[PDB]
Amino acid sequence: MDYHEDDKRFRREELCREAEFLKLKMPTKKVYHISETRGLLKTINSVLQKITDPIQPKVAEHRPQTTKRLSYPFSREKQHLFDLTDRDSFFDSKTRSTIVYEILKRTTCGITSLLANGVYSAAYPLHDGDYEGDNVEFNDRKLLYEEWASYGVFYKYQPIDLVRKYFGEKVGLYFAWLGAYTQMLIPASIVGVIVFLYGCATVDENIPSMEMCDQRYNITMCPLCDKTCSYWKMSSACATARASHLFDNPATVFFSVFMALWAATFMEHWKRKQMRLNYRWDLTGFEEEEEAVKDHPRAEYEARVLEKSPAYFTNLVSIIFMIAVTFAIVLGVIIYRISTAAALAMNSSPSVRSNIRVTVTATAVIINLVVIALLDEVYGCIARWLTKIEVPKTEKSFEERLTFKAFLLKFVNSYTPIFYVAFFKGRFVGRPGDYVYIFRSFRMEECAPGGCLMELCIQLSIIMLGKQLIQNNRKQRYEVDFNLEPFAGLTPEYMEMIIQFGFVTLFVASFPLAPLFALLNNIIEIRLDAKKFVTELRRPVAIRAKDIGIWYNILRGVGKLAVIINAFVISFTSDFIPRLVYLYMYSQNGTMHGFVNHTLSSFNVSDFQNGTAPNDPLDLGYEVQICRYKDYREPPWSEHKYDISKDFWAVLAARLAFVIVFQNLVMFMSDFVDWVIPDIPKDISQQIHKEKVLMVELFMR
Amino acid sequence: MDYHEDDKRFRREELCREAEFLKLKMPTKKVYHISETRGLLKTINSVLQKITDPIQPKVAEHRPQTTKRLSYPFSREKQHLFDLTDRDSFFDSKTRSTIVYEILKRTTCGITSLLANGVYSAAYPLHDGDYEGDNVEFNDRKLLYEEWASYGVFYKYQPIDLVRKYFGEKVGLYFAWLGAYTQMLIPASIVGVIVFLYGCATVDENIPSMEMCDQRYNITMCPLCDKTCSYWKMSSACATARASHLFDNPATVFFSVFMALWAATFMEHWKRKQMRLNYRWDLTGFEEEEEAVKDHPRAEYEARVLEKSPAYFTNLVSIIFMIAVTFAIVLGVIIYRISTAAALAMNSSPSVRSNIRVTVTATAVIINLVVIALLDEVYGCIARWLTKIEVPKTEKSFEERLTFKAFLLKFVNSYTPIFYVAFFKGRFVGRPGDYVYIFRSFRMEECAPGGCLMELCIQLSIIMLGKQLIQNNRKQRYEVDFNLEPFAGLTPEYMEMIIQFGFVTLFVASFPLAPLFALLNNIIEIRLDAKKFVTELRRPVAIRAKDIGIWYNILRGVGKLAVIINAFVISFTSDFIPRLVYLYMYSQNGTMHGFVNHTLSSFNVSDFQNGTAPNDPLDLGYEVQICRYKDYREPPWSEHKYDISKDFWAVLAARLAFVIVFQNLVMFMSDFVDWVIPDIPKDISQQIHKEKVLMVELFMR
């Protein structure tokens, strides 16, 4: 058991005597305010730190931390900058460790500089008691483990005031944002399941899927590979189109519009919720500028430049970063290409007889996720080094610059395969007359029969489900806390949820139940992070924070990019604008009977390109006279044959017109939602006005 | 001459005795603070109001107005909430009249309610001295008339601190914004004149204008009127295309991009300038909420509803307003249509022999401007009534709602003819096979030969120049100020400049010297408004104000709409995308030789529609065999004749693709400029931090 100390530091028991002097210079400056009690162990010794009530309100008034009054309006205890009450335990251990860390950070030799120097191994506050203990007397860590961090309490709300009071406003704000996100993902998931079930209802009776799954037509297609494979009927690969109707029905456009409205509504809902929490925790915004101490490399840089005495390297850093982002785009493209070219020769040596082309795609996206998870650490280390060579002035700007660089690298190498599949997958391959060969050897890529919307959708499925299946498959208190994992930070746990929000808002236009997978991951993730923070981590030092920070701007930017990416998905990969163009220009019946016959373009088989015909052209049981590819081109019985016809330009013009009207109308709807939903809630504004007039009443009397 | 009073009210000398009692109840409540001296005249009597130094710092401390200290950092007098100095004239007449108006507004029977009741005719402060006077002793009104309001001082900067100190922060902020706008219109005008001179340089050697002005081709066009007029060569109406190259060269696209960057830069420049002025005038932002008194109809409404006791009429008001805006769109369209159909029969009865089709267009746009200037008052009165029937709660929300409604009505009926000409002018008329007749009588409209870009450009010219040519073509001080014009408000003078900014930013894509006309109007308008405020108006009561208000949001919205309207202009009316499509798809030479032959589509003359041929088809001196219209259609020697060809869909697809890439890239550039240019200037942030640390130094010692 510990006695009632607040912070705790770790020595290194045994340059060496220079290190001992660098130690002893610090607490001899600390006894000016804070007591000490050096602990004892077997190999490496440790030291304690008890605050004194002489110095407690001195620092508690040095920075105004709004503590509770004695008078209360309408059963709610009012709060003021510093207050007076007996029973000297009204400073909880969170605030006590915050004060002692303020003294540890202000007292020079702060503590972070010598901690990076390596004279102290660790400096951490103490966990209140221990969870699952034998008759522990109302422990806050135990109460949080029982009511918040268990897995069988996933349905319940989370005690956000108690997790704030125990872990600090930063951890409380992360869990409040995660709770608001998982709560806003409920109507998203409901409408997504409704849309998917409507697709399942109309699969059996939509016409352009019956046109593909209908036999007795015998539509012979072109091989879509150079020399290995051969011709194939459109009647065979029709389960792909039958399942693609689930993902490109006319309700998924409604779900795209609804998801942009949902993203704007969630932005406003979290803004109002964090204003409410800033009311409930710290109404005052006295976190002023130029109070944070500069970096030690910043101090060395300014001392060196004033000694030997800067306007070009500060932008050369960003130039290097933009070159790295472009290289990361190209590297993600080629890593996905060699990933889908790695899972090959599946039928010769194993001969498992898949005959679904879903096993090979799942293997491709799984090993692509493996290589991306390997490159994540490299990109993070590169961003850290690339900020450390810039040496920013303050720690806030250092964290924000490192966060933005690591987010751009994670964004790029996480959404590059999906952007590649969704947009630039099978466009720039030519007709069967002349294919576009890259590096003169082999054709570029033709995406899977029935469209590569299905490839995109099962890629999103395997990503949003594999990020869950990879995990699913008597001692003293100070040394017990030493044996835990040090608290790294909230930046990767912010980053994973921002990447998931990007997945949802960017590709609901093709995957209408991405909010369902995100909600089923977040329900587990809230309790997993809760169990981690309670059991496996040292106590975070609990620094105050007003909002999330740069992550809200990142969220708003991803929500802005979601509109244009959804527009481009619905137009250029959903096969939804060709159906409207058929129905409203080339119908002659009012219905889309013959849409597949209008989409597929004929091809005289004798016009190949230097023996690129399949070596066995008899696989369908007959010699083929005309294969039918899919490119909106002129027939071979024409004056201008195989060139682009009028229908390609008509469909393309309608696609771009839909991008224009979708982007404009949906961005205006998002701006209108953000403008109608008010920034300041009525209850919070009325309560702060009432509290301020009651405070000036109390100070006038 | 007056003695040293501060405000001044006007009685009504003669229900009647009830009106006299309603008078006398007010100053008998005013002598609690402020002295009075009832004046004397011949017909209607007046009353004065001298403040007292007993009550002067009492109200000057009731609201903190930051007055100057005695200590100064770096030759700049520091300021604090209220200060102490002898020589009791350090409250200027502006602040003195502000204090007396605060008392007049707070003392019940405020003054505005009884002024609307009609018991006082006028309540105005007094002008310091008089301009152009015989040996006046350093008068501030005279100094402003000599250094700011003269016409021969147009080149000089304006004394913005002195016009603030004499007229209030609202008038100072209007003139500061107008000065920042006219100063930002200098590089705009320079680059616009450079673009126009580049067009004048390349007129003589561009190819598709030589193809039109070249004779010996004898391209016979179609009459573009139903029965009256006849065929005409493209060689005749080629001055129009020769002058249209000035307005649709490839440099005007650069000017559109530069004007969007200029609008974003001007937004950030004014934001920084008004933060600088808010530093220099009132650093404190204590203009709190719920301090403004409610409306008297609002008080009557709440009293009535509590007596007889609202969730539907508050939105029915906006429904009525949106119906009025749609009706105003349709009314502007039909007013411009009957305006261009009014100037007719010019050759029969007058027989002036114009032969330019610029006189009739100038007459059409002039009488359209006349009818729009008549409808402006109707729309303003309708917006005022439509807000008064809503009865908003506070005066700030009343002014903002009335301002937004009057701005939407002015926006609609000011930009409807130009939107109609630029976009929906000659699109929805058919081919010469079947024209689209409206109301079964006459064809819709075919815009002028050589494109109606020229009609749009001379319409913008006549608007932005006619708004300047319509104007270019011993007594006592209290009664002298009574004989002036009462200060109405800054709302129409804001509105005119916002409409001009809309003209500039929305149609620089076709008119590359609209900033030149706006600058030449603003140079006159600054000194005209200065001369008005100095000489012709009563002294405004000088209420403080932080920023412009809703006009900045209106400016930012117009700057956002400018991007998409410029994209649609450059694509769909500039004839710039057909030239790129020709040059990069149908060239066979690398140059655009034959662009007019590719644009014009043939037409067999014998296929008209029920005798809609011209009755004299021999005006060109020969019987015409094929007329050539301009619609990108198939020739009459075809299997599918007169229907839309492949080139129409190709050009339309490229047009929409240019709208997409222009809107996206240019909106990202505007967001990047707004994000790079910082909100808080370095000098102002450093000076407020230095002033605050010096203030806490002075109050700690």
Author numbering:
A (entry chain B), B (entry chain A): 117 to 130, 165 to 259, 267 to 466, 488 to 651, 683 to 910
Study authors write:
Finally, we determined the structure of the mutant I551A in the absence of Ca2+ to elucidate the structural features underlying its activating behavior. The structure at 3.3 Å provides a detailed view of a constitutively active mutant in a ligand-free state. Whereas the mutant resembles WT in the Ca2+-bound state, the Ca2+-free structure of I551A exhibits pronounced differences compared to the corresponding structure of WT. Compared to the Ca2+-free wild-type structure where the intracellular part of α6 has moved towards α4, in I551A it moved outwards by about 30° in a direction away from α4, resembling a conformation that was also found for the Ca2+-free state of the lipid scramblase TMEM16F14. As for WT, the π-helical region of α6 located below the gating hinge Gly 644 found in the Ca2+-bound state has also relaxed towards a canonical α-helix in I551A, despite the difference in the conformation of α6 between the apo structures. The loss of density beyond Asn 651 in I551A presumably reflects the increased flexibility of the helix in the absence of Ca2+. The observed differences between the Ca2+-free structures of WT and I551A emphasize the functional interaction between the gate region and the intracellular half of α6 in TMEM16A. The relative stabilization of the open state in the mutant enables α6 to adopt a seemingly more activated conformation (with partially straightened helix α6), in part overcoming the electrostatic repulsion at the vacant Ca2+ binding site. Thus, it is conceivable that the observed structure displays features relevant to the mutant’s basal activity where, even in the absence of Ca2+, the movement of α6 couples to the narrow neck to stabilize a conductive state of the channel. Importantly, these observations suggest that pore opening can proceed without the transition of α6 into a straightened π-helix conformation.
